Design a protein around this ligand. Structure first.
Ligand SMILES: [Cl-]
Length: 108
């Protein structure tokens, strides 16, 4: 409901192996055909499988933190840092937008 917390929960779910959870965060407005939606879903299915295998390899996620942020009333770019229990960390940007009364992650 605030974009910082949506960025962090999205990221938690991205490393959790649960594709339906991850999908619920995503704005599918760019994908303007059923076949495009499927394509996006198939890629998210794959990303979720891969991040779950990787979290396991790295001893699981230790913490999730926000490093840089740029937020206004309807858009957000948020660098989310994932810290793993093997002491390695990884970061990347989550882009979000509030089109109606709901923040959603944008497909970059
Ligand atoms: Cl790796």
């Amino acid at each position: 409901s605030n974009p910082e917390d949506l960025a962090k929960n999205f990221t938690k779910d991205l490393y959790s192996g649960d594709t339906k959870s991850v999908m619920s965060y995503i704005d599918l407005s760019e994908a303007k055909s059923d076949e495009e939606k499927t394509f996006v879903s198939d890629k998210i299915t794959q990303v979720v499988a891969e991040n779950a295998a990787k979290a396991k390899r790295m001893g699981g996620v230790k913490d999730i933190q926000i490093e840089e942020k740029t937020i206004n009333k309807d858009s957000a770019k948020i660098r989310v840092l994932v810290l793993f229990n093997n002491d390695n960390n990884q970061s990347s940007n989550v882009f979000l937008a509030k089109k109606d009364r709901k923040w959603l992650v944008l497909l970059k």
